[model samples]
Structures are given as structure tokens and as C-alpha cells.
Target chain A: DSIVVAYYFCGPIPDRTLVRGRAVTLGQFKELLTKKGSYRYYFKKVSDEFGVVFEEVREDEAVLPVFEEKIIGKVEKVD
Target chain B: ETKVIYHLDEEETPYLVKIPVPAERITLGDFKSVLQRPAGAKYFFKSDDNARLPCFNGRVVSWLVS
Candidate 1:
């Protein structure tokens, strides 16, 4: 089984996947997010009041399926 | 597992992205890891009523769970 991630955010970053129930590291997920062209942008979780908050997901953390609100955010290149 | 819609705010525009996240309360810390965002960058999610949401440390609720 697998999971689907759609990048319907901007331009044309293709949607990607991760094995369902498989262990994915934060670094690996970042790579997947940037598969279109590595190092183009960095993802931040989207929230209402914070307005693109300043928190970050560490590189070594393990990724799991936790649905509270859909994980979404705007697109921005790293400065 | 179920599907969730990601509302992204880009270039003063709106976009929708979908991903599968098993419905349940998961630790924010765990979810954060998978998020894997870059440091010192700002991004936004479209607001329904143009409302505001606050961002805080995942550990703030460490006593119970995120």
C-alpha cells in the first residue's frame, strides 16, 4: 500500500508518494517534496492565525499518518 | 486510511492539494517530522473567513499529546 501527496500548490510540482505504514524520515520526505528539482523550496505547515509560522520539522523525525487538518502550506523558495 | 485536502496560499492565490493521512489524533511532533519544512521561510494556508491561526511548539502539550 502507498500514500499520495498532491502538490496542487503552484506551478507544476508533481504529486508524490510514500509507502503506507513505512518509515519515512523527515529528510527523505523533504527530498520527495523537492523531487521536481532538489533545493528549490522548503515546506512549512500551514495554519490560520500563525500566518506561516516559524516552526520546523526536524530532519530526523519519523513520519506517520495523522489526520487533524490536512497538511497544507504555501510555496516559497528558501532564502 | 482517508484523504485530506491541503489548502495552500501561494502568490496571493489559492490551491488545493490532497494527501492520505489516516484519520486520527497523531502526535504533532510525529506529524511535524513528516512535514519536513525548511527553516526561516514563510508560507500560508488560505483562510475561510480570513481568520488567523497561531503556531506554537509541539512540546507545549507534551504532557498529554499533540
Candidate 2:
């Protein structure tokens, strides 16, 4: 099977959920990348989650575990 | 229940967060330090003899990096 890919653009958490939307909290976003066989998160120097991207994993970069402990809320499935 | 799926093209979005200030006129090292802690990774930096430090990658995320 092909890899399932999802790209979340960088932006503020919307006040209202839109249809067909996935709401990922900051902590949850980080944690997803940390898990084994999970998606990778890449960010620039500013520490913004949306600034990160995932395609195929890189061999040179170190991967960290998902930070499940810091999550404060759920990402609502809108629509 | 049935599910409906849709796909969208790639795009860029920007967000902002506030960093705490310990002193005025922060240095690039200090700024980079804040980025490393929250990101859990060492930030890449390049220096030139005539100029100050600058980040190579913009805050834009892309599939190419993964």
C-alpha cells in the first residue's frame, strides 16, 4: 500500500471548526512525529509546527518521540 | 457511518508565538536557543566573516524536507 500522507498548512487554530477539517493541537502535532512508523515533523528556526513537513524520512536527521504528555486538547474532526 | 474523502493541494500558512524576554536586544544565539528547546533539535546555522548569523531555511514547511 502507498503511504498515507497529510499536509497541515501553518496557521492559527481556527476559532470555529470547518467541515472536513482536522484540528491538531501543538503538543499532539509534535507527538505524532515521535511515534514509530509515524509521520515526521519538520520546522524551521522559529519552532512553529505548521512550518514542518513530512514526506519520506531522512537518514541524516535524528527523530524524537511524540510528546503525548504535553497535549492539552483534542483535534476536532470538522465537517 | 459512511465517510467522504477529499484532497487538497499543498500550501503555506504562517503563525506567530511570543517568546519571553530576559534582556533587551537579543542575539542570534539566544534566538536560536529558544527554537532548539521547543523543537528538540539542533538548529542549523551558517556564518560569514562579514555578516551576522542567518537561518537558511524559512519557516515554510515542505514535503521535500521529510
Candidate 3:
């Protein structure tokens, strides 16, 4: 029944996305992440940072962040 | 899924959006406010006539230039 509703994912967003020092194209980003929910769960670069969620988070909807924690580490993605 | 798409002719990159649900409850203005162009293309909607609107399943809903 514990949820940290105030916490949202954020990023510095490089000139281009990179995984393990390898540059990834915007096309790839859109495919690998954005389009997963048909533009639902998306990330956009603005003011030099990015914020994201695995699903659409609406203001009118109660955002209850429930989860399974094991890796305890977010590698440039969700945390 | 019903989508509000926007495409340009030259250096064209349309926002071929995909509405999560195929419901008819949504319309043009319902989709625009929360969305932006994929390539950040600049444009707007002008319903003065059908001169600048996009077709959806043979029906005109929204548009592209100006």
C-alpha cells in the first residue's frame, strides 16, 4: 500500500541517446520506447532533460507507483 | 485505433499518430492539444473549408498545413 507518487523519472538526455557508450538514433528511441504503448510511454527532450513512465500518467488519474524491486538499479531508464 | 495524422510533401515527416483505442468518441480538437508533431514540424488547423484537412477512412477529420 506504499506509493511514492511525487517521484518521476528524469534524464539529462545526450545529443543522442546512448546505451553503454553506443549512440542510438531517435528512430530507435521512438521504436524501442515511445511506440511501445503507441506513443503512450514516451520520452521527449526539453530544456536539456527528459522525463518518462512505462505507461501514460494522467493528472486526473491516481498515479499509484506500485512495483517489484530487485535490480535496485536503473540503468539510464526507469528507476 | 483511430489516429490524427499530419504529413508534409517536401522533407515530409507526418505525425502518423495512433490512438490507443478505435473509439469514435474522439475528434480533431480532442487529439491536438496534448500532441505535437514527430519532427517538431510547425503548422495549424484551418477549418474554413476542406482545402487543408486530412482524410480518415474516407472521412475528413483534421489537417496538415496552415
Candidate 4:
């Protein structure tokens, strides 16, 4: 029942949401990526649904997920 | 009822999907989960209302979807 307009860090990320927009800076955004916080929610897109999305890794960088972002949007359909 | 659909570019192969929720009833909240909870990849939705177009990112991606 909620829209999760968020992105994960394959490298580094900008904090964005439908609400926050870009109100969050990289400094503050790192807070969520902290080991003590929701950083664990990050995951490696292993394979398919048979894999995991939300994850916890105090592990090495090589073990983390790698994401290449894209320009994604909607074209308001109208006649 | 039709299901909501979006593009999932997970790297290896892209996803052409009609999302699980009913097209008319899907919420942004659910859309968020759909993108993250299972896929863990970056995704976006284009509402053609029905005409489809294929779009790719520039060198850099822009904003987030709601």
C-alpha cells in the first residue's frame, strides 16, 4: 500500500522518494546505509524472485550488489 | 482486471512484466515494494495510457518513480 520510490547503491546514491524528492543529501543519506540502521535492507539481486532483495551485509564491498541505474519514467497516456 | 506493468532492467536480461496487482488499483506504495522487495534492481513505469515506447537511460539516470 505504499510506493517505494527509492534506489540502492551499487556505487553511491542520491536520496530520493516521491515525498522527499531530493531533500536528502548524500551526507544524510548515508545514515540509512549505516550498519546500525536500515542499511541491512540493501540486497544483491541474486537471480530471480527465488533470490533476495532486502539484505544485511556488514561484509566486503565485492559482496555487495552492483546496480547500474537507468532513465526511467512514464509517458502520461492520453488521447 | 489487468495487472500493473513496468520495466525491470536487472542487467542480464530485461523484464517485460504485467505487475502482480490489478492495473487500476496498483498504488505507488505497492509499486515501490514490487521494485525492491523481490527484484532488487532499478526500474521505472511508463503509462502509455496504452501506446508503448522503449526508453533507455542517458549517461546518467534522473529521478525516482512514485
List candidate 1 segments past 4 Å from native: A8-13, A18-20, A33-55, A62-75, B1-66
Error of 3 at B29 (Å): 2.8
Q: Note the B-chain TM-score for every model.
A: 0.28, 0.29, 0.38, 0.32
**Per-residue lDDT of model 2, residues A47-70, tens digit only:** 233232222212333332222221
Task: Give the candidate order by descending lDDT.
Answer: 1, 4, 3, 2
> On TM-score, who's better, 1 or 3?
1
Model 1 over residues B1-66: C-alpha lDDT tens digits?
222222222233222222223334333333333444444233332231132222232111111111
Clashing pairs for model 2 are A19-A79, A23-A75, A31-A66, A31-A67, A34-A65, A34-A66, A42-A52
Each candidate's clash count: 5, 7, 0, 6
Interface RMSD of 4: 14.0
Candidate 2 per-residue lDDT over residues B7-59, each given as its tens digit: 11333422222224332333345444333333333322333122233322322
The best-first sequence of candidates by TM-score reads 1, 3, 2, 4
Which of the CAPRI classes, incorrect, acceptable, medium or high, describes model 4? incorrect
The best candidate in terms of TM-score: 1
Clash pairs, candidate 3, are none
Comparing to the true complex, what docking class would candidate 3 get? incorrect
Candidate 4 per-residue C-alpha lDDT over A1-79 given as tens digits, one digit per residue, 9 for 90 to 100: 2122345444334544432323322333344444433332333333343122332333333233333332121111111
DockQ of each: 0.04, 0.06, 0.03, 0.03
RMSD of 1: 13.1
